[PDB]
Amino acid sequence: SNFINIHVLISHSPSCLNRDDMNMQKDAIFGGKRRVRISSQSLKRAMRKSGYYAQNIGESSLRTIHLAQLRDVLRQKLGERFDQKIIDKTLALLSGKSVDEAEKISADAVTPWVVGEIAWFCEQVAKAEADNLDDKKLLKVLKEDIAAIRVNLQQGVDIALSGRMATSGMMTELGKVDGAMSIAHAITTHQVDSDIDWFTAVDDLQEQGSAHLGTQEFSSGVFYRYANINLAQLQENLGGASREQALEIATHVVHMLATEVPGAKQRTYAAFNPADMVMVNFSDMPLSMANAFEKAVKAKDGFLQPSIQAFNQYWDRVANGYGLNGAAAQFSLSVKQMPTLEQLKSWVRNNG
Amino acid sequence: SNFINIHVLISHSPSCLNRDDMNMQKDAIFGGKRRVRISSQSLKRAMRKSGYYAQNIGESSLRTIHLAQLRDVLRQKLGERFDQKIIDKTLALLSGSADAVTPWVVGEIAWFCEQVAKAEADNLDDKKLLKVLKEDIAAIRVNLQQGVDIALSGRMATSGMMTELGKVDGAMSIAHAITTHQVDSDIDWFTAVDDLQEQGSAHLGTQEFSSGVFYRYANINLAQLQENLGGASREQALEIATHVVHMLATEVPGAKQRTYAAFNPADMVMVNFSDMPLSMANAFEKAVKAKDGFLQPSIQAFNQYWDRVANGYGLNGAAAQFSLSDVDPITAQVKQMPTLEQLKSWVRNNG
Amino acid sequence: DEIDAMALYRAWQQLDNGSCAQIRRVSEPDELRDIPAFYRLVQPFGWENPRHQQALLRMVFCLSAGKNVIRHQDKKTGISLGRALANSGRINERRIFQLIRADRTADMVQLRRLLTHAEPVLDWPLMARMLTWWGKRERQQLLEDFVLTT
Amino acid sequence: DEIDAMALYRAWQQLDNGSCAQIRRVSEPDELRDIPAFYRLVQPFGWENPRHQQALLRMVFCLSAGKNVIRHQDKKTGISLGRALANSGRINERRIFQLIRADRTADMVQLRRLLTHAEPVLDWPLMARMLTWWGKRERQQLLEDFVLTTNKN
Amino acid sequence: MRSYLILRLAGPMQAWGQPTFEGTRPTGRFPTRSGLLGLLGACLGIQRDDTSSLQALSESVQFAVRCDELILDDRRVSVTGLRDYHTVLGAREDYRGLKSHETIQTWREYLCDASFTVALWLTPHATMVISELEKAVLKPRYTPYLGRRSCPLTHPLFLGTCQASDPQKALLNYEPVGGDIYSEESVTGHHLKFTARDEPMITLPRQFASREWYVIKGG
DNA sequence: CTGTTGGCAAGCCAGGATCTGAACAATACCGTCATCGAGCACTGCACAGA
DNA sequence: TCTGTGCAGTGCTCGATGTTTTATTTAT
């Protein structure tokens, strides 16, 4: 089985975990009913910026469009390994932009960068001009072993998982990455009519009334999180890593998808809720369980119990109808049953 | 009957499966109301480029075409325009007891015969001929080892096919997929946080997305499939058709799936044989209204439509249906299949 | 066939203090269904016809901000709601966005808060016509009228 | 899965004078579960199903206000309870509020007294449905029909 | 009175070509002469190289097309246009070889909520008989479609057969009546013509000659 | 075995005022015309002679 | 019996370049 599907049902107390241009909760129509939504990009950034990622996976990539500021970072970080001239040309070749001393140098678009990957490149650049090898032929040489470049993404795994594109520089040819992880926007299993908080700000120098009156949207919600990992693609994106290496990374994603919650509005709403159900399943074709909630879940002693129940019933329907028999395990607080998340994670680590 | 009609109802979670040159979701007006659309070409490519297709169609047994076994019928087919000297010279230089022969094979070889016939007249051979026709020969050799793929989907966008008989249509015809219901699409307003920027983001943008219960329709021309397989049998054609049924139920276009992940299988699959292939799209011409979702009322509207028009439209013939739902069934004239595999077997066994 | 908007406006204006107070303390349009005074107000305007019910709920709930918050002014189309909210010079553009983006019931709640703040002078039958349909088109025209005024 | 309201209405009207008198004697609906004649009446109406019985308690208790109190009629919607109480002209609006604001079992007692007082001409199956879903929606439509009908006259 | 073969052309999407040599593939308002011949030629087992019976079909048959308005819930639904941004990956760069472009662009127009009723009769020196054309539309050999293979039919091709004095009088027997008719044969009270280049030159593949419809407005 | 009936259900009057409703920064790029000849690559070609 | 420098033979990517675009701006 090449795919690892991950299914999370997580319930949040009143909160505003993801909002749009007018500070209103993100949402989506599913089954003709409004669902509160948390974007996949919000989930991915919450994971890559988390402590768990830092401890168990490593450094998240540097995503920026400001090459002049990037230039100065690399000079401070790669200074004791390379001379300033080589560092500047490396960035210039990769970005396709003239790296001089300008206060503002801008890339085509926001781009993820990996210092370790840039460090690997300037070695080649140094050896290139040393061997009197020009840039046009340098590119031709580097295109012949992209796997040797992708080994550097072990220092920037979030790129191996989520991908990268570039439209200028050598990154166009050498830095094209198709992410190994697919992830959906988290949506509530049920209909939500959002609440509105009418607030004031009391002014200590104003005795009559308040200095500001306002409204803020918020709600609760049981959310369905889905993601899968393409193991073969993850290995290729890491320069030819082993399946055990890919499986361990997948296991950290499972953990983060069950525990990591976006930080937005959490200082004043504090919805720090862990998942109540996690389900992992190996398959040959990616399988989302979203249609378990296409008919919006009606409340019955809460939304959580009928959501989990709806999930289980639809899982059986699909398995029985499509004859699916990939390995599967399920952890719950409310198919191999796992009492703890840790046992569930060992299971995944051991290829199911 | 000659035609296999395949009807699929498939529900997708919030996504953007098919978009245009403004990055807007593709759509269509049907019954005067906006439906989100997944184009024919998008759906068909998702099938043709899939792994399942590469294993069951790309690596079929009928895949390979042997010019050696085709010598006899080719000798009489081209025998009135060409004489056996050229026909056999051609047949051998291309490669280095067959009853029938695929039309595009005849036509493309006949073109090569025209070239060598003009080569003898112009009094040039050796490498000069194999230099001029180098790419052309390489082209047909590749095509002779992809016979099922060509018979099912038609020739590729670059094939090197030379003649009018070389314009090879697919034996399966895939319609544009449209939602059974009206859709007002959502908008995702997004940021890109710059790790080196203090105030605000480095980019802002929007992306259109929506859910949708789609109706997929496809038909298979059996005789055309058999005829383009060198005269294969009904059973062999029905075996290919089984794979199409499977792909139309499970294959989804990859667009935006890395970030929206709408990896949903079909909730309803129905197959029926007929002399005249018909889409059942008018089951949703009056746009389906939501009642505990769009999926249940859509299957219901599909069933009620079949019960109403099948007889008068001449949709008598073998009909079977697979469904993940327990919605009130169609007429008893349609045989209920509890699993997809049982439905596929029903197709192999001619209905 | 169509609700007499000015008649309803006058009826609300000369309503007794009791019936008026009973209607005003409502917190959302649907709660008007619990108020006897509400039914007597809208009965001569076609309430028993289900066609008119959702419109009458919106109209009266907007009026329920107070007898003196919406000031009708005759045409010289007439002052729309969007222009009238901008004319006050009290309402931030961001609050108009939040209004026109809001879903059911929540939109009426936010609208009434805006009426309370703005105390608009407008063409009431024109606003009632807007409240009758209240489709996506009407909500976008509200925002665009507000912006075109400022 | 719905109770045949008209059949229950007929079953009550035809019931022997002794059995129905034993039923009327009851003071609150829960006490009907101790009267033998009660089960004798509601047996061919699915008393076995726990979902039906709470509604059956309400329906019979209203029917047990008298036998001639609720004159059923036929649609020409059909007269609702709210319209009927207002049509009698004997009930004032504050007594209607005392119904829709009353707690459990207290509501049925009040309704009983109201039926006796008003002696309404209405559509019984329509009323039976109200008593089955005796919820916030039914209380609200009850007040609506009463206020509108009263205000019309 | 002559015999007529009555056809129905209904589907959510249709395409009826106009002259082009560009990546834009335009549609007209109603079915073309060339498109109707191709549809018939598909029901019959005619291959693209068989110019003989390709010319036998063209010389034997003439058409009359009526535009039918979709009525829904007693409401009229108009025909709308649709623009499809249609790309092709690895499309041929030349007519021989295997060299190809990364991406090419095309723009294809469709009709939405369109439906048509077609009257069909034999020329005075026809080869075939309407009896065998009826058989062809009931049991087509090649897959029938509305302009493009991606456009299926939602109603059977065959609608009926009848005898009548003129094509207009024939189409009268079949609801919905009222739509404008474009005919290859002129009818008495009408004199308007519709010019078009949709007469397929059969001796010159994929090329078209100028011709003219007789226009007959509906009441 | 047998369980009832009449007569009757209210009115007055009363629902507030003050004052307040934010600001900043940021919205991307590529390819989907063509021409000509040159400088410089796969890529088979037999061989001659090793 | 395999293999090596010359080809012939050409498959190319290289770059400068043929042309040519603009139309608006509520209501108060």
Q: What is the DSSP letter of D30?
A: G
User: The tokens 């407005």 sit on which residue?
Assistant: E217
Strand G lies under 7 A from the Cβ of residue B131: yes
Phi, psi angle pair for E192, to nearest 5°: -75, 145
Residue B106 Cα, gap to closest chain A Cα (Å): 39
Strand stretches in chain B, DSSP E: 3-15, 27-30, 33-38, 172-174, 177-179, 186-192, 203-221, 268-274, 319-323, 335-337
Give bridge partners of residue B12 from the DSSP assignment.
B212
Residues in chain D: 153
The answer to whether D143 contacts chain C (CB < 8 Å) is yes
Task: Return d(Cα B326, Cα B338) in angstroms, integer.
Answer: 11
The answer to whether B339 contacts chain A (CB < 8 Å) is yes
Give the angle subtended at the CA of B291 by the CAs of B285 and B296, to the nearest 5°: 70
Longest dimension (CA), chain E: 58
Q: What is the DSSP letter of E14?
A: E
Do residues D134 and D58 touch, judged by C-beta distance below 8 A? Answer: yes
Task: Return d(Cα B156, Cα A71) in angstroms, integer.
Answer: 47
Structural tokens at position E52:
């003989």
Other CB atoms within a 10 A radius of the CB of residue E202 amount to 17
The answer to whether A24 contacts chain C (CB < 8 Å) is yes
C103, C107, C111, C143: best to mutate for the A interface, most A CBs within 10 A: C103
Do residues A198 and A247 touch, judged by C-beta distance below 8 A? Answer: no
**Through-space separation of residue B130 CA and nucleotide G11 C1' in angstroms:** 16
The answer to whether C34 contacts chain D (CB < 8 Å) is yes
Dihedral of CA atoms B322, B323, B329, B332 in degrees, nearest 10, equals 10
Task: Return d(Cα A226, Cα A257) in angstroms, integer.
Answer: 9
Structural tokens at position D29:
């609906």
Structural tokens at position B211:
């859910």
Structural tokens at position A239:
């320069």
Between the two ends of chain D, the Cα-to-Cα distance in Å is: 39
3-state class of B208 per DSSP? strand
Do residues A217 and A16 touch, judged by C-beta distance below 8 A? Answer: yes
Residues 6+ apart with CB under 8 A from B91: B67, B70, B71, B74, B109
Structural tokens at position E178:
């009222």
Do residues B109 and B74 touch, judged by C-beta distance below 8 A? Answer: yes
Residues 6+ apart with CB under 8 A from E147: E14, E15, E16, E17, E27, E31, E35
CB pairs under 8 A between A and B: 143
Q: Which residues of chain B lie closer than 8 angstroms to A163, CB-CB? A: 258
Strand F lies under 7 A from the Cβ of residue B201: yes
Q: Nearest Cα to B216, choosing from B185, B253, B186, B242?
A: B253
Residues in chain E: 219
- Run of H or E including E215: strand E207-216
Helices C124-133, C53-63: crossing angle, 10 deg rounding:
130
SS3 of chain A: the string is CCEEEEEEEEEEEEECCCECCCCCECEEEECCEEEEEECHHHHHHHHHCCHHHHHHCCCCCEEEEEHHHHHHHHHHHCCCCCCHHHHHHHHHHHHCCCCCCCCCCEEEEEEEECHHHHHHHHHHHHHHHHCCCCHHHHHHHHCCCCHHHHHHHHHCHHHHHHCECCCCCCHHHHCCECCCEEECCEEECCCCCCEEEEEEECCCCCCCCCCEEEEEEEEEEEEEEEEEEEHHHHHHHCCCCCHHHHHHHHHHHHHHHHHCCCCCCHHHHCCCCCCCEEEEEEECCCCCCHHHCCCCCCCCCCCHHHHHHHHHHHHHHHHHHHCCCCCEEEEECCCEEECCHHHHHHHHHCCC
Task: Return d(Cα E95, Cα E115) in angstroms, integer.
Answer: 37
Per the structure, the residues numbered 85 to 124 in protein chain E that have their CB within 7 angstroms of any atom of strand G are: 99
Task: Return d(Cα B103, Cα B227) in angstroms, integer.
Answer: 8
Do residues B213 and B11 touch, judged by C-beta distance below 8 A? Answer: yes
Structural tokens at position B128:
């000069």
Contact B29 E112 (CB under 8 A): yes
The answer to whether B255 contacts chain E (CB < 8 Å) is no
Task: Give the residue before each break in chain A, using a C-to-N cut-off of over 2.5 angstroms; say none if it is continuous.
Answer: 334
Task: Return d(Cα E203, Cα E88) in angstroms, integer.
Answer: 30
Domains in chain D, number:
1
Do residues A308 and A9 touch, judged by C-beta distance below 8 A? Answer: yes
Phi, psi angle pair for D51, to nearest 5°: -70, -35
Strand A336-338 to A328-332 pairing:
parallel
Q: What is the DSSP letter of E44?
A: T
Between the two ends of chain A, the Cα-to-Cα distance in Å is: 10
Give bridge partners of residue E10 from the DSSP assignment.
E115
Residues in chain C: 150
Strand F lies under 7 A from the Cβ of residue B199: yes
Strand A181-183 to A33-38 pairing:
unpaired
The answer to whether A193 contacts chain C (CB < 8 Å) is yes
Task: Return d(Cα A211, Cα A197) in angstroms, integer.
Answer: 17
Task: Return d(Cα B313, Cα A148) in angstroms, integer.
Answer: 62
**Per-position b or e across C90-111, b if 16+ CB within 10 A of its CB:** ebeeebbbbbbbbeeebbbbbb
Residues 6+ apart with CB under 8 A from A178: A163, A233, A237, B258
SS3 of B271-311: the string is EEEECCCCCCHHHCCCCCCCCCCCHHHHHHHHHHHHHHHCC
Do residues E27 and E18 touch, judged by C-beta distance below 8 A? Answer: yes
Residue B303 Cα, gap to closest chain A Cα (Å): 19
Q: Which residues of chain C lie closer than 8 angstroms to A215, CB-CB? A: 98, 110, 113
User: The tokens 């950034």 sit on which residue?
Assistant: A45
Between the two ends of chain B, the Cα-to-Cα distance in Å is: 10
Task: Return d(Cα B100, Cα B72) in angstroms, integer.
Answer: 10
Domains in chain A, number:
1
Structural tokens at position A345:
């994670």
Q: Nearest Cα to C15, choosing from C4, C7, C27, C5?
A: C7
Closest residue in chain B to residue A179, using alpha carbons only = B258
Task: Return d(Cα D96, Cα D110) in angstroms, integer.
Answer: 9
Do residues D151 and C40 touch, judged by C-beta distance below 8 A? Answer: yes
Phi, psi angle pair for E41, to nearest 5°: -65, -20
3-state class of B146 per DSSP? coil
Q: Nearest Cα to B183, choosing from B71, B60, B287?
A: B287
Long-range contacts of B323-329 (CB under 8 A, 24+ apart): B323/B267, B323/B268, B323/B269, B323/B299, B324/A314, B324/A317, B324/A318, B324/A321, B324/B267, B324/B268, B325/B267, B325/B268, B325/B295, B325/B296, B325/B299, B327/B296, B327/B299, B327/B300, B327/B303, B328/B300, B328/B303, B329/B303
Render C32-55 in DSSP notation, one character per residue: GGG-HHHHHHHGGGTTTSGGGHHH
Residue B134, nucleotide of least CA–C1' distance? F44
Structural tokens at position A43:
């989930």
Other CB atoms within a 10 A radius of the CB of residue B160 amount to 24
Q: CA of E87: how far to CAs of B19, E108, E148, in Å?
A: 11, 10, 16
Nucleotides of F under 7 A from a protein CB: 2-4, 9-11, 14-16, 18-33, 45-46
Q: Which residues of chain A lie closer than 8 angstroms to C105, CB-CB? A: 193
Residue A211, nucleotide of least CA–C1' distance? F20
Strand F lies under 7 A from the Cβ of residue C116: yes
Task: Return d(Cα B277, Cα B217) in angstroms, integer.
Answer: 10
Q: Nearest Cα to B257, choosing from B12, B7, B50, B39?
A: B12
Give bridge partners of residue E214 from the DSSP assignment.
E183, E193
Give the angle subtended at the CA of B74 by the CAs of B73 and B78, to the nearest 5°: 120
Do residues B152 and B173 touch, judged by C-beta distance below 8 A? Answer: no
Gyration radius from chain E CA atoms: 18
User: Cis omega before residue E176 (within 30°)?
Assistant: yes
CATH number at residue C105: 1.10.520.40
SS3 of B74-134: the string is HHHHCCCCCCHHHHHHHHHHHHCCCCCCCHHHHHHHHHHHHHHHHHHHCCCCHHHHHHHCH
User: The tokens 């409310």 sit on which residue?
Assistant: A334
Do residues A48 and A263 touch, judged by C-beta distance below 8 A? Answer: no
- Run of H or E including D98: helix D93-100
Closest residue in chain C to residue D151, using alpha carbons only = C40
Q: Which residues of chain C lie closer than 8 angstroms to D151, CB-CB? A: 39-40, 43
User: The tokens 């048509």 sit on which residue?
Assistant: E116
Residues 6+ apart with CB under 8 A from A221: A11, A12, A35, A36, A188, A190, A192, A303
E24, E49, E83, E206: best to mutate for the B interface, most B CBs within 10 A: E49
Q: Nearest Cα to E143, choosing from E134, E153, E135?
A: E153
Per the structure, the residues numbered 67 to 86 in protein chain C that have their CB within 7 angstroms of any atom of strand G are: 77, 83
Between the two ends of chain E, the Cα-to-Cα distance in Å is: 24
Q: Nearest Cα to E111, choosing from E9, E30, E19?
A: E30
Strand C121-122 to C71-72 pairing:
parallel
Phi, psi angle pair for A275, to nearest 5°: -65, 150
Task: Return d(Cα C80, Cα C82) in angstroms, integer.
Answer: 5
Task: Return d(Cα A48, Cα A252) in angstroms, integer.
Answer: 11
Residue B60 Cα, gap to closest chain A Cα (Å): 20
Neighbouring C-alpha atoms within 13 Å toward the C-beta of A184: 31
Strand F lies under 7 A from the Cβ of residue A212: yes
User: The tokens 């390979």 sit on which residue?
Assistant: B64
Q: Which residues of chain A lie closer than 8 angstroms to C113, CB-CB? A: 215
CATH number at residue E43: 3.30.70.2660
Q: Nearest Cα to E22, choosing from E136, E104, E122?
A: E104
Task: Return d(Cα E29, Cα C71) in angstroms, integer.
Answer: 53
Strand A33-38 to A27-30 pairing:
antiparallel
3-state class of C126 per DSSP? helix
**Resolution in units of Å:** 2.5
Residue nearest to nucleotide F19 (CA to C1'): A209
The answer to whether B184 contacts chain A (CB < 8 Å) is yes
Q: CA of A199: how far to CAs of A216, A237, A266, B76, E124, in Å?
A: 8, 49, 17, 91, 87
Q: Nearest Cα to E185, choosing from E174, E171, E202, E175?
A: E171
Structural tokens at position D111:
């309704």
Domain of residue C9: give its range.
Answer: 1-150
Contact A34 C103 (CB under 8 A): yes
Task: Return d(Cα A253, Cα A251) in angstroms, integer.
Answer: 5
Q: Which residues of chain C lie closer than 8 angstroms to A24, CB-CB? A: 98, 101-102
Q: CA of A128: how far to CAs of A69, A93, A137, A141, A170, in Å?
A: 26, 13, 9, 10, 15
**Per-position b or e across D20-57, b if 16+ CB within 10 A of its CB:** bebbeebeebeebeebebbeebbeebbbeeeebbebbb
Task: Return d(Cα B65, Cα B56) in angstroms, integer.
Answer: 17
3-state class of E176 per DSSP? coil
Neighbouring C-alpha atoms within 13 Å toward the C-beta of A16: 17
Task: Return d(Cα B53, Cα A34) in angstroms, integer.
Answer: 37
Q: CA of A169: how far to CAs of A89, A101, A107, A111, in Å?
A: 11, 19, 10, 12
3-state class of C105 per DSSP? coil
3-state class of B331 per DSSP? coil
Which residue of D93, D143, D151 is in closest CB contact with C43?
D151
Strand stretches in chain D, DSSP E: 71-72, 121-122
CA–centroid distance for A24 within its chain: 22
Do residues E75 and B24 touch, judged by C-beta distance below 8 A? Answer: no
- The answer to whether E and A touch (≥3 CB pairs < 8 Å) is no
SS3 of A277-305: the string is EEEEEEECCCCCCHHHCCCCCCCCCCCHH
Give the type of residue at C108: M
Domain of residue B69: give its range.
Answer: 1-351
3-state class of C82 per DSSP? helix
Q: Nearest Cα to A99, choosing from A124, A132, A64, A72?
A: A72
Give bridge partners of residue A231 from the DSSP assignment.
none
Task: Return d(Cα E96, Cα B133) in angstroms, integer.
Answer: 10
The answer to whether B205 contacts chain A (CB < 8 Å) is no
**Through-space separation of residue B107 CA and nucleotide F37 C1' in angstroms:** 38
Do residues B101 and B77 touch, judged by C-beta distance below 8 A? Answer: yes
Strand F lies under 7 A from the Cβ of residue A210: yes
Q: Which residues of chain A lie closer than 8 angstroms to B261, CB-CB? A: 40, 182-184, 226-228, 286, 288
